[PDB]
């Protein structure tokens, strides 16, 4: 987990390496991002393992909830992001190298 | 997880370091050991995290189900064990050093 928020955007990075994309759900409700995962795996000798989590995050009030995106990388990182809407009211300048 | 089984006993070791003793349940049913854990934690900014698992293990038919024990170590290791009942039918000899 890393949650980053700047003037331009809000981003959640969440390591979910033990989960398949179909195991995950992401919902936004009442100004919270709600992320759930559940993965079940058969073991040797008729055992099984279930891994499960929930993560609730507060969503800043200026994130555009009509422009949210979420993706899962091949290496198991979930990225959830949204741009911030300008309200009309120091500014970092990128240094290229 | 490590599951060990010798002529004397059956032992499950399971790392549950993110769980409190009150978060865990252990049940034996239909020749399976069923271990569950769920731990919820409040975060900063009104977030929360839930961690949850299930682990089902087959219990050997010769384990004495009247003499099962389970404990959680300070460092978060769960040990579940039972002795085997002698049936009446090579044998390792310990080497002390």
From Swiss-Prot, chains A, B:
Molecular function via GO: identical protein binding; metal ion binding; structural constituent of eye lens; unfolded protein binding
GO cellular component: cytoplasm; cytosol; nucleoplasm; nucleus; protein-containing complex
Positions of Zn(2+) 1 binding: 39, 41
PTM description: Acetylation at Lys-9 may increase chaperone activity.
Keywords: Acetylation, Chaperone, Cytoplasm, Eye lens protein, Glycation, Glycoprotein, Metal-binding, Methylation, Nucleus, Phosphoprotein, Zinc
UniProt region (Important for oligomerization), positions on chain: 91-97
Function per UniProt: Contributes to the transparency and refractive index of the lens. Acts as a chaperone, preventing aggregation of various proteins under a wide range of stress conditions. Required for the correct formation of lens intermediate filaments as part of a complex composed of BFSP1, BFSP2 and CRYAA.
Subunit note: Heteromer composed of three CRYAA and one CRYAB subunits. Inter-subunit bridging via zinc ions enhances stability, which is crucial as there is no protein turn over in the lens. Can also form homodimers and homotetramers (dimers of dimers) which serve as the building blocks of homooligomers. Within homooligomers, the zinc-binding motif is created from residues of 3 different molecules.
Protein name: Alpha-crystallin A chain
Organism: Bos taurus (Bovine)
Gene: CRYAA
Part of the intact protein present: 62 to 163 of 173
């Amino acid at each position: 987990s890393e949650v980053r928020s700047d003037r331009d955007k809000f981003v959640i990075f969440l390591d979910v390496k033990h989960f398949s994309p179909e195991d995950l759900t992401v919902k936004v409700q009442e100004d919270f991002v709600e992320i759930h995962g559940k993965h079940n795996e058969r073991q040797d000798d008729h055992g099984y393992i279930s891994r499960e989590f929930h993560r609730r995050y507060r969503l800043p009030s200026n994130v555009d909830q009509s422009a949210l995106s979420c993706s899962l990388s091949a290496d198991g990182m979930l990225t959830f992001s949204g741009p911030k809407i300008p309200s009309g009211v120091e500014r970092a300048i990128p240094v290229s190298r």
